[PDB]
């Protein structure tokens, strides 16, 4: 409860209607209730969970950046810092909710590569969003948790997936962004995007038309970042 009495299938169905109505807080709440039924998520359901929370935290991050900028310009009453702190605490709350679902329900030592990598990338992403608003020593611990999650995901992906696999590609892209934007390691970020891009390009010849489009769309994002960064 509030989703405890609803059938798993009905929560999934409603998550999909909430998506069509762009009601992403409802979608997240329905997917959280689904995960709490304790059965593993299918590939389509993992994507629903992630789209829902990506949109919820996407909004909070965008608002936080607005309010942060206004606060730095003003750095007078406490209202700007108060309201930035309120948004921040809410954003942290949603991060902690996702990390909680990942830790308590979803991350398994067992696992197919496609699920284990997907969730560990997620864990890295949500710690990264916590790192964006963190300061000082709390920050270094948070940064290390993100790094550790992305690293385990990378190790699995490189053992268990081909270098064009879109989940593997999206992971390298986000870990490269972690290096560049959070970890103060632009050379590592550049090297990771480069090697990822070039190892995927080398392998495109093995793909169908539709797999080629999936993989290349993400490669193009790698290239856009490399182009931005160099």
């Amino acid at each position: 409860g509030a989703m405890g009495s609803m059938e798993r299938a009905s929560l999934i169905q409603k998550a999909k209607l909430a998506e069509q109505a762009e009601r992403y807080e409802d979608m997240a709440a329905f997917m959280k209730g689904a995960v709490e039924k304790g059965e593993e998520l299918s590939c389509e359901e993992r994507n629903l969970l992630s789209v829902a929370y990506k949109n919820v935290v996407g909004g909070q991050r965008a608002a936080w950046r607005v309010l942060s900028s206004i606060e730095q310009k003003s750095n007078k009453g406490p209202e700007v810092r108060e309201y930035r702190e309120k948004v921040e605490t809410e954003l942290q709350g949603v991060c902690d909710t996702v990390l909680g679902l990942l830790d308590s329900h979803l991350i398994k030592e067992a696992g197919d590569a496609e699920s284990r990598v997907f969730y560990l990338k997620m864990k890295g992403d949500y710690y990264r969003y916590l790192a964006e608003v963190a300061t000082g020593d709390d920050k270094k611990r948070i940064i290390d948790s993100a790094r550790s999650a992305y690293q385990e995901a990378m190790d699995i992906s490189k053992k268990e997936m081909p270098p064009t696999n879109p989940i593997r590609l999206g992971l390298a892209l986000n870990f490269s962004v972690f290096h560049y934007e959070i970890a103060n390691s632009p050379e590592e970020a550049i090297s990771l995007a480069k090697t990822t891009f070039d190892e995927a390009m080398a392998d495109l010849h093995t793909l169908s038309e539709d797999s080629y489009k999936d993989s290349t769309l993400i490669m193009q994002l790698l290239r856009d970042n490399l182009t931005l960064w160099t």
Binding site: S50, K54, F118, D125, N174, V177, E181, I218, L221, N225
Partner: peptide, 8 residues
């Protein structure tokens, strides 16, 4: 800020 993956 560098963009991250826009999909899940």
């Amino acid at each position: 800020r560098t963009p991250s993956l826009p999909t899940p």
